[PDB]
Homo-oligomer: A and B are copies of this chain.
Amino acid sequence: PQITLWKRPLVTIRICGQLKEALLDTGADDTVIEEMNCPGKWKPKMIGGIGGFIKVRQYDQIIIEIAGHKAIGTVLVGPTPVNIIGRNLLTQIGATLNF
C-alpha cells in the first residue's frame, strides 16, 4: 500500500497469536510492543526516546505479521504508550519513505 501521513500510520500486527495495532515508525531503530506474556529467552534492555528511557525485555527471532507481511526479528516488550514498528522490521516488509 501507500500510507499517507495525515493520520498516524497505524497498522494491524499479529504477534504471538494475538492481533494488535502498531505504529509504523521510521524514527525507531527497534520495535517495541506493549507488555505481552509470550515466553522465551530474553535479555534486559533500556531504550531511549524523548522524555528519557524505559526498561524493556528483548526477545530475538520473533515472528510478526505487519499489515499482512510476514517478518522475523527482534521485538522489545515493555511499558510503551503505543506499539511501535521500527526500522529493524520495516526493512523486512520492504517499506520506504518517498517524496
Contact = CB atoms under 8 A, between A and B. Distances in A.
Interface of A: 1-6, 8-9, 23-29, 32, 47-54, 69, 80-81, 84, 87, 90-91, 93-99
Contacts of A52: 50-52
- Scoring A26, A47, A94 by chain B CB atoms within 10 A of each residue's CB, the highest score goes to A26
B2 A96 contact: yes
Contact of A9 (B9, B80, B97): B97
A47 to B, nearest CB: 7
Contacts of A9: 26-27, 97
A54 to B, nearest CB: 5
In order of increasing CB-CB distance, the 4 nearest A-B pairs are A51-B52, A49-B50, A25-B27, A51-B51
Contact of A98 (B8, B27, B98): B98
